[PDB]
Ligand binder design. Structure first.
Ligand code: DAT
Length: 174
């Protein structure tokens, strides 16, 4: 198997559907799915603790070092609720999943988030923080917002991205 394969970033507020989409994409394309939070947990890539948010702080440099070789080889779908620290060269396309605030709140409430965590996350979405972070970090032409409210939308997202992957592979393996 000697094909050039693309790298895809799935970003957006926690709860929007990144993991659901990334896992389905991996199963249906054979690309490797990487959950950055899970990777950080497995490889213990943390430095410091945030007092106000009550969470260990992701060690961004170590995450980058951990992933770099694999990213260089291509064919990776990366899922994280942040994107400014990734090398720009990693990604061929970046999707920012978006979820209506009312819908997102019900999802995050079901997760058992307390009030402070619910509020911070919900404001993150309503202020469009990750969308702005993606646009600030990557070329406008490769950043796309995806609706992620209903199963029908997940289905459309899977379909559109699978079609994009197929076209990209053709274009970069002449
Ligand atoms: N497009 C969609 N329509 C309806 N429910 C969705 C959806 N995408 C995800 N979900 C559900 C699955 C989970 O119960 C919840 C959060 O999904 P997720 O994949 O864990 O989000 P994230 O990885 O962005 O935090 O929403």
């Amino acid at each position: 198997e000697f094909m050039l394969l693309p790298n895809i970033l799935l970003t957006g507020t926690p709860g929007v559907g990144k993991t659901t989409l990334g896992k389905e994409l991996a199963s249906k394309s054979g690309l490797k799915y990487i959950n950055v939070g899970d990777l950080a947990r497995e490889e213990q890539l943390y430095d410091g603790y945030d007092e106000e948010y009550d969470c260990p702080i992701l060690d961004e440099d170590r995450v980058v070092d951990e992933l770099d070789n694999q990213m260089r080889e291509g064919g990776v779908i990366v899922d994280y609720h942040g994107c400014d620290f990734f090398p720009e060269r990693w990604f061929h396309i970046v999707f920012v999943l978006r979820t209506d605030t009312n819908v997102l709140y019900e999802r995050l409430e079901t997760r058992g988030y307390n009030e402070k965590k619910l509020t911070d996350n919900i404001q993150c979405e309503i202020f469009q923080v990750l969308y702005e972070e993606a646009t600030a970090s990557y070329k406008e032409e490769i950043v796309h917002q995806l609706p992620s409210n209903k199963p029908e939308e997940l289905e459309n997202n899977v379909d559109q991205i699978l079609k994009w992957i197929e076209q990209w592979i053709k274009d970069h393996n002449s």
